């Protein structure tokens, strides 16, 4: 019966909890304490990319590590050139509210989404020379938060109606759907192996989904508020997340435990974006304190502050080659660090 | 530097000038957010507006750019993401004034949106629609049967109007930082646009005073 169902659910919860308690031996701090400190890290603003009109919300890099795409709430998609500070395209938009952008690995397509409940895909390479929209995906009943590419015809979409789905571009209809998050999904990331992905849905919960199998594998719960950012460790067996509890965390997909608690007393604001570094030794995080901070994976001691903005940092990214780090905030300016 | 980067620079300069052209039109823009119920008559108000998901309607009054945003079915959103409309200068609230059962739910919705912390820099304007029936039910229907504070006789039109105005005004917490205008207008009237323009003018006047003189 339903009461028996509750009893079985509680028993399964107890089994999972007991197994997780059994798997623990020591702490990551204990394991990594004789390791040498990374040292003081001081960086400088090398290039400022001015030209936007309104607040910038997100940006994404590319495979060539030269071209980046930025988007704002005025309704413009501007593609920049990092080295020479020369604008390449300025794609005009129809809907003036967007909250995500993406760059195809091949370099022939860009995507964006917002409150229109519709995904838009643009074709950069065209004989005429004008960037034009190719497909207009529709079918969601909630606002689109984040979108990422997997192939030249496969895209992954997360929405606020507690659904995540995978589409076929030419076909224009969804292939698989993912259900199980109680709250609305906010952020997602793709594994380097391109066979699994993880996302958080504002319920202090992280779930791992499989592209081909189509059911959730594991679930992690360690926070006390909505999760705002997520990204993958370089290898592919760890992911880190940040929330409004002013605390970041690191998990393991094989051990099934949380390892470390990046925390400090002075910070009382939320986390906007989180990204790793090339060798998995830095965990940069964007705070609401009108600044950004740099942490350590195995020490969790602060290294440096990339201050220099006048408002809230909203996006963060690290180039594929491992050269530069980009920041975008509501002052309508992008800055390229080193 | 190579006869090609020069052309790239020229293309960049053309794009920059194209953006700088739109900057001026962006700067002199006034945004309005419309939130209303099903019976509020927002459809009729929008219809009479132009005779003289997220939908957008643009109009011009006295050579001033205006922008109205209509949100339907997304008012139930209660997360921080939806608070991206943090640059609007005024919020309209069309409300029915006929049915005293619906007045209650309208009051809770008003409480829901006006006390939100992000919208602490918006001049809230409240248009009481209908106001043609209420003149015909004051002498017929007694509003005392729904609320238990109205001292004045429900057949008194002015007393009922003061009752409703006080009930709406007292709903806002945190005293009052930004003003709260109100008017008793129907849908056939044509001066509502002028009323909105005058209210926005007063709001900008107050902002300019604070920014420049008193500080």
């Amino acid at each position, epitope marked *: 019966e339903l009461d028996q169902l509750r009893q079985e659910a509680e028993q399964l919860k107890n089994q999972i909890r007991d197994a997780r308690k059994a798997c623990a031996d020591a702490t990551l701090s204990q394991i990594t304490n004789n390791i040498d400190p990374v040292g003081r890290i001081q960086m400088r603003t090398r290039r400022t990319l001015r030209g936007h009109l309104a607040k910038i919300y997100a940006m994404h890099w590319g495979t060539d590590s030269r071209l980046l795409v930025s988007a704002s709430q005025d309704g413009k998609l501007i593609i920049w050139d990092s080295y020479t500070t020369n604008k*390449v395209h300025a794609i005009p938009l129809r809907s003036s509210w967007v909250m995500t952008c993406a760059y195809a690995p091949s370099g022939n397509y860009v995507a964006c989404g917002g409150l229109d409940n519709i995904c838009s895909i643009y074709n950069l390479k065209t004989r005429e020379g004008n960037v034009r929209v190719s497909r207009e995906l529709a079918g969601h009943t909630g606002y689109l938060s984040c979108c990422r590419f997997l192939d030249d015809n496969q895209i992954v979409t997360s929405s606020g109606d507690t659904t995540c789905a995978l589409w076929d571009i030419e076909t224009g209809q969804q292939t698989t759907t993912f259900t199980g998050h109680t709250g609305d999904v906010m952020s997602l990331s793709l594994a380097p192996d391109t066979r699994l992905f993880v996302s958080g849905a504002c319920d202090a919960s992280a779930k791992l989904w499989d592209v081909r199998e189509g059911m959730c594998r594991q679930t992690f719960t360690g926070h006390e508020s909505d999760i705002n950012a997520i990204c993958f460790f370089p290898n592919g067996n760890a992911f880190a997340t940040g929330s409004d509890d002013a605390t970041c965390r690191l998990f393991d997909l094989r051990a099934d435990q949380e390892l470390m608690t990046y925390s400090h007393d002075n910070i009382i604001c939320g986390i906007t974006s989180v990204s790793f570094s090339k060798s998995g030794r830095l965990l940069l995080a964007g705070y609401d304190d009108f600044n950004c901070n740099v942490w350590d994976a195995l020490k969790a001691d602060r290294a440096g502050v990339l201050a220099g903005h006048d408002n809230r940092v909203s996006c963060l990214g690290v180039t594929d080659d491992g050269m530069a780090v980009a920041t975008g905030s509501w002052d309508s300016f992008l800055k390229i660090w080193n | 530097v190579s006869a090609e980067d020069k052309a790239a620079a020229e293309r960049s300069k053309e794009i920059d000038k194209c953006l700088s052209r739109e900057k001026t039109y962006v700067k002199r823009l006034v945004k309005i957010l419309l939130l209303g119920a099903d019976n509020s008559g927002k459809s009729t108000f929008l219809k009479q507006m132009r005779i003289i998901g997220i939908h957008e309607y643009d109009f011009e009054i006295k050579n001033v750019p205006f922008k109205m945003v209509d949100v339907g079915g997304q008012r139930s959103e209660r997360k921080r993401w939806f608070e991206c409309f943090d640059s609007v200068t005024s919020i309209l609230f069309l409300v029915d004034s006929s049915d005293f059962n619906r007045l209650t739910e309208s009051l809770n919705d008003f409480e829901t949106i006006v006390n939100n912390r992000v919208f602490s820099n918006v001049s809230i304007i409240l248009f009481l629609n209908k106001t043609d029936l209420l003149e015909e039910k004051v002498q017929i229907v007694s509003i005392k049967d729904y609320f238990l504070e109205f001292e004045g006789d429900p057949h008194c039109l002015r007393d009922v109007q003061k009752f409703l105005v006080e009930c709406f005004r007292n709903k806002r917490r945190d005293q009052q930082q930004k003003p709260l205008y109100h008017h008793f207008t129907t849908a056939i009237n044509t001066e509502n646009a002028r009323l909105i323009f005058r209210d926005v003018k007063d709001t900008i006047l107050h902002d300019n005073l604070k920014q420049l003189m008193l500080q």
Partner: single-chain antibody
Amino acid sequence: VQLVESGGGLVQPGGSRKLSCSASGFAFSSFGMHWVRQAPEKGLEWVAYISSGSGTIYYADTVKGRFTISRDDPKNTLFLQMTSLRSEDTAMYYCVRSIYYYGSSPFDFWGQGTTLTVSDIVMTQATSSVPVTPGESVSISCRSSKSLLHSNGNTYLYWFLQRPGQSPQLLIYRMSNLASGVPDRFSGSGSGTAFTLTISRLEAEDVGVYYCMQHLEYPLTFGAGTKLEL
């Protein structure tokens, strides 16, 4: 897309004439335009170039002050004016489209052009027409004087093909990259002042005259070319 050229015909020594070019099928404002002439049975030569938005105009040193170039955006028309014609100007004219930004394909489309009759870095393209049979691989080398390796790590040399009775078509741009709608059998490489085009397994519709080009600094230079045919 289609580009048409008109305004050509028989003329007497002296006088004047205006040429016309028609564009239809693409964004005319974004693209820049060039003019290229060809002697009856000789090489090619660059004439002029107007940038996007009619910002900057460059002219050839062979003739200057007697030619005028202007564009008309709303009608998608390009026209050129000539005065004081000379016997050296007896040539059939061409129109060229080119765009400039990171990762572009300049000099992609060539118009058929028109005819007319009145009454610097140097390239060494030895002609030495090599007889060839189908299925054999060939290599053609073009020589340049000044090193074409600008410090930005970019080589600026192009290739072209012109079948008889047709217009030149782009094959390889920036010394390595292939163009759109070209067979993968075409391949090229080289180093500074060392340029070679390695074709493999020749097929039909490969007869014509090839050409090499520079784009390092104005003015532009062409070459005679070799007739790859048997």
